[PDB]
Curated annotation (Swiss-Prot):
Organism ancestry: Eukaryota, Metazoa, Chordata, Craniata, Vertebrata
Record protein name field: Neprilysin
Consequence recorded when altering residue 294 to P: In CMT2T; uncertain significance
Positions bearing carbohydrate: 91, 231, 271, 574
SUPFAM superfamilies referenced in this protein's UniProt entry, alphabetically: Metalloproteases ('zincins'), catalytic domain
Membrane topology according to the record: Single-pass type II membrane protein
Keyword Hydrolase recorded: yes
Binding site for Zn(2+): 530, 534, 593
Family listed: Belongs to the peptidase M13 family.
E.C. no: 3.4.24.11
Residues annotated to bind a peptide: 49
Catalysed reactions, semicolon-separated: Preferential cleavage of polypeptides between hydrophobic residues, particularly with Phe or Tyr at P1'; substance P + H2O = substance P(1-9) + L-Leu-L-Met-NH2; substance P + H2O = substance P(1-7) + L-Phe-Gly-L-Leu-L-Met-NH2; neurotensin + H2O = neurotensin(1-11) + L-isoleucyl-L-leucine
Peptidase M13 domain boundaries: 2-696
Disulfide-bond pairs as recorded: 3-8, 26-681, 34-641, 89-357, 180-188, 567-693
Length: 696
């Protein structure tokens, strides 16, 4: 009664080669599940992290390279553009011959970069204004510095867009890096050195004198500036309640409550907003509704900015944009980023050009690239099987509502309502393959020159920003997908209340219409449950069936949610990560993801049990002395096999809201009675603690 098919032997060999049977499953399931893989692999010099997900990404890029590198006579314009963009990106000779020339041409359009400019105050300082300079970078290039103003979906009215004001991203991975000592010292040093290196290259190219001390003096001041801005930003832990972050105010209330004086101005929120919106010829009055996500940051900002000159501010502002462009310039410019990237990612080399390029055009033309990808690698008949798995897991979610003792009937009803309303998106939107007109029109305004990569990326920046700003008065498009098809990942959108499973993730180990169901439910089944459960985590639970930020929880049920969640906050907060130097994970920042993991795996298991009851046991896999309940958990764990570079581990423990793969495995299985039952784990064995967390 052993399956001897090609498909069964492929998956069995993979499972067998990845696992380490010499490790007791109940002592450490990550080692048991991934030990074979760990011993065989070493993180590539160009990778920050390596494992199942990254391997799948590398493989998807091979497909992209295959479909983009060769022109085909019957290619529609949309496809011709993606290939021309790809070609401009991989032509390093053409790029290298241009030096930093394309950047130099750009500088005057962003008020320059003081350090690499002679007499900046006379040239730009004369007509300079915080409102114009910040707006220029924001509206033409998408670079949000000092004050992040953007057009997005109204948290409280899903169908509309509204202007949002929030704190900006930083040059370093997170606000923590700015302590600049111990584990962060090399990063801060490399960052300032990086600033200095680029300023030096620009000066040498522009034929300007180079005073090393002056370069150091100016760049250290931008670091001093950003340190203050970093310290002023609110921690992620204080931004995890959607209800509290949402503060709708009029531009008048903003001008009144959040005064700012820069370079002796004062700051005009109306002028700043219009300097931005004018790009799309949209006028704003002081009566305009704005959602402020960082009122405290704006408040703390006032005293900070008065201590700095227009020159200091612009040195940081242009730097933040320039650091993102340097890798699109000649080799000399590319090399200046070496120490910085090693400090942040641990990588000693850049990823292959063709891979960075495939990724770049996939990210900028997701529908065009998605179309080629699915035609080359996705079997349309998979969509149906997946549709069915989703129907099954959604059902299991609803059924489980009855067993949950911590919620009252009224709240369970609304939870059921929300669950039923979840809209699924599987594989790719049929339109990208069947509607050539629409696909072409999406890229109509884009015209790529094969020998001008830099001009091409700048055009994409302007186009994407214009497209975004133009949405202010428009309604949110219902049929719009939140992800391209050639992506190895899955998502959940609170505002649209939808789950998306791109074609890129509908492949082994996650799914295959031909692999054993235990594997399917353990992989993609768990993924579907993860996404659905996001609609009910510490963030998602705050949004209703239509994606509106509104409370549908009774005070008691809301209170019980936090109590049940707290168990996971402490559980994960207690895991110490060796790669990150023994630091503990952030149980609060990873809460949502941990809830999704734990809820999702149980939901998938429940669904698998339903499948077995209704269909009977499956033929076992050859070479594995494990039954299907055990294979279910083995596959789930192998989805997460992987490892991290120390430098990137220090980065991800701060920036990744997901727990590292090994802890996603250990944490989830520790809370699973089904797992311990499947592997006969003794009580209190490492993988089977008496105390188990559970929310969904
Ligand atoms: C269950 C898994 C298949 C999908 C699941 N996606 P999900 O958490 O819904 O969503 C992800 O994280 C969110 C915080 C962001 O808002 C999303 O845009 C998305 O990046 C996840 O753990 N994604 C992780 C793991 C992962 C997916 N693709 C990867 C590629 C490389 C490395 C890791 C990954 C991530 O995005 O990191
Ligand atoms: C790269 O660009 C240069 C300059 O335009 C050109 O001579 C060369 O043909 C291009 N190489 C390829 C492979 O297209
Ligand atoms: C913004 O204010 C400046 C004065 O600093 C003015 O020159 C400019 O025209 C104003 N822009 C808009 C869009 O009102
Ligand atoms: C670790 O778990 C204990 C037990 O509940 C908890 O009291 C403590 O706060 C946790 N520590 C962290 C860092 O989460
Ligand atoms: Zn998630």
């Amino acid at each position: 009664g052993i399956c001897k098919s090609s498909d069964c032997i492929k998956s069995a060999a993979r499972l067998i080669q990845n696992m380490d049977a010499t490790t007791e499953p109940c002592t450490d399931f990550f080692k048991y599940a991934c030990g074979g893989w760990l011993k065989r692999n070493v993180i590539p010099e160009t990778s920050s992290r390596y494992g199942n997900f990254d391997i799948l990404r590398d493989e998807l890029e091979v497909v992209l390279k295959d479909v983009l590198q060769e022109p085909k006579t019957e290619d529609i314009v949309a496809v011709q553009k993606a290939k021309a963009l790809y070609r401009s990106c991989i032509n390093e000779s053409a790029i290298d011959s241009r030096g930093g020339e394309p950047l130099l041409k750009l500088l005057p359009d962003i008020y320059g970069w003081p350090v690499a400019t002679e007499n900046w105050e006379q040239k730009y300082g004369a007509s300079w204004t915080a409102e114009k300079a910040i707006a220029q970078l924001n509206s033409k290039y998408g670079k949000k510095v000092l004050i992040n103003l953007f057009v997005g979906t109204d948290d409280k009215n899903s169908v509309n867009h509204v202007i949002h004001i929030d704190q900006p991203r930083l040059g370093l991975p997170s606000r923590d890096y700015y302590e600049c000592t111990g584990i962060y010292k090399e990063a801060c040093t490399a960052y300032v050195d990086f600033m200095i290196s680029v300023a030096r290259l620009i000066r040498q190219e522009e034929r300007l004198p180079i005073d090393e001390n002056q370069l150091a003096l100016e760049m250290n001041k931008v670091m001093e500036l950003e340190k203050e801005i970093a310290n002023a930003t609110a921690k992620p832990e204080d931004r995890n309640d959607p209800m509290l972050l949402y503060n709708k105010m009029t531009l008048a209330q903003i001008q009144n409550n959040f005064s700012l004086e820069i370079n002796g101005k004062p700051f005009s929120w109306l002028n700043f907003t219009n300097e931005i919106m004018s790009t799309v010829n949209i006028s704003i009055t002081n009566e305009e509704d704005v959602v402020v996500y960082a009122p405290e940051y704006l408040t703390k900002l006032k005293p900070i900015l008065t201590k700095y000159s227009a020159r200091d501010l612009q040195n940081l502002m242009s730097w933040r944009f320039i650091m993102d462009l340097v890798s699109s310039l000649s080799r000399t410019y590319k090399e200046s980023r070496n120490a910085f990237r090693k400090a942040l990612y641990g990588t000693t080399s850049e990823t292959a050009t063709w891979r960075r390029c495939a990724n770049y055009v996939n990210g900028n033309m997701e529908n065009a690239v998605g179309r080629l990808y699915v035609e080359a690698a996705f079997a349309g008949e998979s969509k149906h099987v997946v549709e069915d798995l989703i129907a099954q897991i959604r059902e299991v979610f609803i059924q489980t509502l009855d067993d949950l003792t911590w919620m009252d009937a009224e709240t369970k009803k609304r939870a059921e309502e929300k669950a039923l309303a979840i809209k699924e998106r599987i594989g790719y939107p049929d339109d990208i393959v069947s509607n050539d007109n629409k696909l072409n029109n999406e890229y109509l305004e884009l015209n790529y020159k094969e020998d001008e990569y830099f001009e091409n990326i700048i055009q994409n920046l302007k186009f994407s920003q214009s497209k975004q700003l133009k949405k202010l008065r428009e309604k949110v498009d219902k049929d719009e997908w939140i992800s391209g098809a050639a992506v190895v990942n899955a998502f959940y959108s609170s505002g649209r209340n939808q789950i998306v499973f791109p074609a890129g993730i509908l492949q082994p180990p996650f799914f295959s219409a031909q692999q054993s169901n235990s594997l399917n439910y353990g992989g993609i089944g768990m993924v579907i449950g993860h996404e659905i459960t996001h609609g009910f985590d510490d963030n998602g639970r705050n949004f209703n069936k239509d994606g509106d930020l509104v409370d549908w929880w009774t005070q008691q049920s809301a209170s019980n949610f936090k109590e049940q969640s707290q168990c996971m906050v402490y559980q994960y907060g207690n895991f110490s990560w060796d790669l990150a130097g023994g630091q503990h994970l952030n149980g609060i920042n990873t809460l949502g993801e941990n809830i999704a993991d734990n809820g999702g795996l149980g939901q998938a298991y429940r669904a698998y049990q339903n499948y077995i009851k209704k269909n009977g046991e499956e033929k076992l896999l050859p070479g594995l002395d494990l039954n299907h309940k055990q294979l279910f958990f083995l596959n789930f764990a192998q989805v997460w096999c992987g490892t991290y570079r120390p430098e990137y581990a220090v980065n991800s423990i701060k920036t990744d809201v997901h727990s590292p793969g090994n802890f996603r495995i250990i944490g989830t299985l520790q809370n699973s009675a089904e797992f311990s039952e499947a592997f006969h784990c003794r009580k209190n064995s490492y993988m089977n603690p008496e105390k188990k967390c559970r929310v969904w």
